[PDB]
Ligand SMILES: NC(=O)C1=CN([C@@H]2O[C@H](COP(=O)(O)OP(=O)(O)OC[C@H]3O[C@@H](n4cnc5c(N)ncnc54)[C@H](O)[C@@H]3O)[C@@H](O)[C@H]2O)C=CC1
């Protein structure tokens with residue numbers, strides 16, 4: 001009774017930076033060719049969504065943000081072959097077109113159809129499916145999950161197990177997969193190694209999960225909020241350090257602790273200074289450091305290249321290095337086989353209508369992941 | 375008839391920065407415990423030696439520089455077990471103590487006994503074996519090969535094949551192994567890939583040799599001295615570009631030429647700007663860039679960490695990543711089995727007494743490697 005028709009529903013519109021989300025009626029157009037309209041069931045509150053509000057991450061406004069989510073297909077456009085109405089799905093903020101040089105490469109996942117490098121805030125065809133107060137509203141990363149209904153391109157959606165608990169597996173759409181894959185796929189943490197994880201939010205906890213699953217012997221959590229330490233130890237940290245407790249720079253502290261530097265370090269905050277600190281604390285001849293956190297837009301860091309000349313490796317990744325459409329269904333299957341846990345990441349549950357309360361919980365430092373239910 | 379007693383011989387002493395070498399008589403003390411005194415046979419002129427003259431590379435002066443060489447053992451100190459008088463040897467500017475955490479690691483080579491991170495300019499025991507006009511003269515990287523005789527610690531020397539042609543395999547002591555290993559071992563260049571090599575001197579030509587040996591389909595040489603292009607194509611470059619010929623920045627040019635970025639790039643010059651350019655020109659989702667050139671002392675570069683977050687890998691290495699004492703004898707043995715060629719790197723052969731002329735050739739852009747013969 002809605003297929004082929006405009007849907008009127010509620011969404012959280014961000015009209016301007018540094019303001020609350022506005023929950024209002026929007027019109028959602030029906031899917032065009034190779035597009036999928038999804039009834040949202042659950043969406044997580046990720047720090048990257050907050051970066052849009054704060055201006056850290058620039059994308060066209062007004063916008064419907066949200067990118068970590070799960071829902072049920074309401075209708076499909078012409079030509080769609082990979083999902084059907086009623087299928088459980090996870091939208092993919094990094095697409096998998098399957099046809100570009102990255103999608104065809106054995107290791108890359110930053111598909112050239114992404115909307116991150118040069119954000120337009122549209123569908124792949126350059127237009128919007130959202131209207132509000134007579135105005136077109138932009139999409140975000142081709143997902144826009146802060147809405148009861150969204151429309152995504154087929155290359156930005158993955159079908160998942162029909163028995164999946166959507167209020168939990170939405171985290172596989174961003175936070176969990178990003179952190180876990182950064183450890184197991186990007187760094188390729190080795191058995192018995194020493195790791196340092198800077199930032200113990202949802203993504204940093206998922207990095208710790210991956211480091212533990214890879215068999216690391218020591219996992220040192222680093223955060224300026226000591227209230228984060230208890231959960232970090234629960235999921236695998238052997239030790240936690242607060243840089244504010246020390247008179248020396250923390251890279252010196254970590255270097256003494258690891259008897260000359262860690263095997264693998266991870267920046268999971270989004271600060272230029274901690275990216276350089278994390279690189280410095282890995283062992284100078286063979287350490288690996290992975291940037292996961294997103295820094296403020298268009299800001300350069302300063303570093304001494306002799307840190308690399310001695311033998312260090314420095315890399316970054318989006319979405320844990322996972323090719324999104326291949327990997328998301330396998331990760332859900334793994335969760336359904338109890339190969340990893342997601343409950344440790346979920347600290348709060350709220351109805352979607354309280355999205356602003358959910359963001360203030362994140363900003364206050366109190367929450368890890370708040371899951372919003374539609 | 376020289377064992378146990380001081381040797382008078384000629385050496386090229388650098389008394390202060392930005393002066394010609396002074397060829398004069400020095401006194402070489404006999405080797406102490408676990409030290410080796412070597413009669414030099416041939417030594418190459420590497421840009422890193424010129425960095426000492428210019429002050430780009432800071433090390434205590436006055437000094438006997440030189441680190442790319444081959445010679446014959448004159449006498450050994452008490453406790454030496456890995457070489458004997460009469461053995462052909464290559465001094466190692468990166469030692470291999472075999473006992474530190476790096477030496478025991480399967481993939482590291484920057485031995486913690488190195489004299490590069492905080493140069494002292496001495497033997498491992500903190501003293502000098504060189505005297506000139508009654509003044510003590512510092513060592514360089516534990517090698518000091520610009521002398522008819524030098525003394526090195528046993529962890530800084532490798533025994534090589536008794537049949538080795540010393541006037542060619544001296545390049546295995548630095549330039550060739552550094553460039554070749556940067557490609558085959560550090561970058562791990564793959565068959566069919568596209569490579570970009572910035573700097574077509576002795577080390578950059580060896581990088582090209584390594585990329586070709588690894589089966590790269592395209593190898594783009596980058597140099598502002600177009601006189602370097604002919605030799606670069608001889609050893610494997612498919613094409614060469616001079617940044618001064620373009621109105622656009624060269625990372626944009628290389629990205630367009632490679633239809634979206636190269637698989638592997640190498641900075642083999644020693645400039646901060648080309649380090650960042652070489653990183654930018656590799657493919658944003660899966661490219662790898664290796665820093666080989668040495669930056670000027672105590673200078674930081676500036677870069678956008680979003681270059682790494684998209685998926686690039688940035689790394690550096692000393693001596694091609696080779697564990698020095700294990701690898702140098704195998705590389706000589708490989709040379710002897712005709713596995714690679716060294717003659718294309720040698721453009722000039724001069725007597726040791728013409729060391730200053732050899733440096734003038736390097737500074738003028740005319741030479742690749744000048745080999746000095748004693
Ligand atoms: N590369 C990718 O694909 C993705 C990147 N991100 C980015 O990952 C980063 C982390 O995201 P979340 O875990 O959701 O954020 P979060 O805000 O929940 O966790 C950040 C943690 O860093 C701590 N912290 C802040 N400043 C610190 C400092 N100077 N030193 C030590 N710790 C500090 C905070 O106390 C906090 O616990 C964000 O920048 C996010 O935008 C998130 C998902 C995907």
Ligand SMILES: NC(=O)C1=CN([C@@H]2O[C@H](COP(=O)(O)OP(=O)(O)OC[C@H]3O[C@@H](n4cnc5c(N)ncnc54)[C@H](O)[C@@H]3O)[C@@H](O)[C@H]2O)C=CC1
Pocket residue numbers: 309420421422425548549552572573574575576577578596597598599602617642643644645648665666667668669691692693694739742
């Ligand atoms: N990582 C390691 O273990 C080692 C590092 N090195 C360093 O490698 C670098 C290269 O050494 P060599 O091949 O002996 O030096 P070289 O002086 O023979 O070659 C440098 C080349 O770079 C070119 N060049 C200079 N400025 C340029 C610019 N702005 N843009 C493009 N090209 C430019 C020059 O024309 C020249 O052909 C040096 O910095 C050396 O100190 C050398 C050996 C070992």
Ligand SMILES: O=CNC1CCCCC1
Pocket residue numbers: 046048049057067093116174294318319
């Ligand atoms: O958190 C989800 N996506 C992120 C990926 C890194 C750039 C900012 C957006």
Ligand SMILES: O=CNC1CCCCC1
Pocket residue numbers: 420422423431441467490548668692693
């Ligand atoms: O060229 C030989 N050794 C180099 C290695 C990199 C730092 C400067 C010295």
Ligand SMILES: [Co+2]
Pocket residue numbers: 046047048049067068174175
């Ligand atoms: Co996210």
Ligand SMILES: [Co+2]
Pocket residue numbers: 420421422423441442548549
């Ligand atoms: Co050298």
Ligand SMILES: [Zn+2]
Pocket residue numbers: 095096097098099100101102103111112113
């Ligand atoms: Zn693609």
Ligand SMILES: [Zn+2]
Pocket residue numbers: 469470471472473474475476477485486487
């Ligand atoms: Zn060692």
